[PDB]
Ligand SMILES: O=C(Cn1ccnc1)NC[C@@]1(C(=O)Nc2cncc3ccccc23)CCOc2ccc(Cl)cc21
């Protein structure tokens with residue numbers, strides 16, 4: 001029993017974290033095989049950040065300008081190239097701790113674990129979700145750039161996020177490992193604002209299923225709803241639309257608990273229109289949307305890595 | 306900016322997780338140097354869970370009855386001894402991945418990371434607090450026994466908890482790494498109940514300071530309170546008494562934010578009386594008590 005916000009074990013990623021220094025800026029890099037990946041803004045000064053020409057800044061750099069440190073060992077940079085907003089530093093040594101890995105771009109609503117690092121050293125691991133407005137509500141201080149987001153499938157690490165910046169509201173923006181930003185963000189010191197966020201409906205439903213698996217049934221009701229009536233109500237509360245794909249993905253949880261997805265949707269509709277009325281679900285007074293249906297099945301069935 | 310429930314990176318502990326089998330029971334063990342630590346109840350059968358005589362059961366066991374598996378390698382058990390409720394299996398190989406470590410017994414309100422494991426394999430990492438009733442609100446299924454709780458100080462792992470059982474309310478009980486249970490629990494299936502739990506007041510105050518550091522000030526008020534008046538109000542909401550030790554520990558956060566501890570105590574009294582009125586504090590509609598003052602300083606600065 002119990003339901004916690006749980007991250008993947010971070011060991012496979014910790015063995016890849018390195019420190020990247022360029023001039024006065026120090027941030028984190030991901031060392032996989034003979035390449036260190038890091039945010040390209042490591043080459044910027046405070047003036048350069050205002051309006052940077054990264055191709056122009058990078059051409060002026062030499063390999064010896066990038067100081068890469070893996071633990072207490074300095075790695076030798078033998079090449080450098082840029083792929084979108086990520087800098088790739090070719091090093092003379094393949095990381096012996098390189099796990100089986102893939103670079104995957106995730107969709108909003110998908111969750112992943114973040115290994116927050118400072119000076120190439122892992123300091124914490126937390127689970128979060130790619131918000132529908134493409135930001136992540138992370139916990140990051142200055143020096144955390146280059147910290148990565150990942151998932152684990154069997155013994156394979158799928159790297160899905162690299163931290164680049166903090167927006168004025170305290171939310172975070174970053175790229176996939178190919179340097180493509182999530183959301184309409186750019187890596188420049190300029191006015192940028194996160195769009196109005198919405199609730200990840202499929203994830204709230206999955207978390208309501210987790211609550212039922214744990215014995216919390218007070219919110220269940222006798223009613224069902226159509227997918228269109230649920231979406232009409234959901235749109236009014238800034239909830240993401242629920243698609244037939246989401247209904248299908250919730251199939252196993254629906255079969256395990258005996259509560260049809262549209263039956264759970266009618267519970268969610270009442271929760272939105274009436275509130276919790278002083279009650280809680282899994283120790284929360286708010287509807288939690290950072291557990292996907294896969295996270296719920298994985299936690300409630302004990303899948304290992 | 307931002308405030309998350311954050312666990313320590315689990316890598317140093319993952320390299321210590323092994324699978325321990327004794328008869329038909331399989332659970333997790335912690336392999337440090339040449340010793341595998343695990344709950345002693347791994348030696349129990351169906352007839353031995355109500356009133357086990359562990360000394361009697363262990364004397365009947367031989368080293369070859371304990372099957373220890375580290376990845377796809379079977380370790381050879383060369384000795385066995387019991388220390389309180391933990392079984393120590395001496396093995397013929399020192400764990401090459403043994404980090405710098407210590408065994409530390411924690412106090413209620415203290416937080417730690419849990420690496421939940423099944424069959425010696427890590428499945429997830431989450432953050433916990435030792436509740437004032439000495440239980441932990443974990444997420445554990447059958448087979449998670451032997452999963453450990455820890456903190457990291459620089460490169461040193463402090464092991465503070467080993468999972469032993471789930472109580473009828475779904476909360477969890479276990480021991481330190483010396484086998485001493487936290488709370489009045491025993492490793493028997495005899496009727497056991499967690500005492501009425503209370504809110505870790507010092508941790509709620511620390512989290513209110515984290516909210517102020519992050520720009521959330523709506524709950525602040527112009528009032529202060531005496532320590533005794535705060536405690537008289539706090540007990541009525543099943544909050545733990547706040548001691549002078551707790552006030553002292555909150556000193557650095559008080560200095561950083563400019564809000565005296567008793568001033569923050571009056572904000573907490575107001576929140577308990579009014580509720581949140583549709584507002585949240587750090588994305589939460591409830592007062593969070595699983596961040597210590599040390600966690601807040603570490604995460605924020
Ligand atoms: O690492 C540097 C260098 N640097 C040296 C001292 N100050 C900054 N700069 C990255 C920066 C950013 O936002 N990153 C940070 C990440 N996470 C949390 C943060 C908390 C506090 C302050 C910065 C944070 C600074 C602000 O301007 C921008 C704008 C765009 C981009 Cl892509 C990046 C940044």
Ligand SMILES: O=C(Cn1ccnc1)NC[C@@]1(C(=O)Nc2cncc3ccccc23)CCOc2ccc(Cl)cc21
Nearest residue numbers: 001346349350351445446447449469470471492493494
């Ligand atoms: O593995 C054995 C079952 N066994 C058979 C044969 N020999 C032993 N026992 C562990 C047990 C316990 O509580 N563990 C579990 C831990 N975490 C989550 C759980 C979720 C579901 C079910 C069990 C859980 C079972 C219940 O009775 C007790 C009583 C005391 C103790 Cl210390 C241990 C246990």
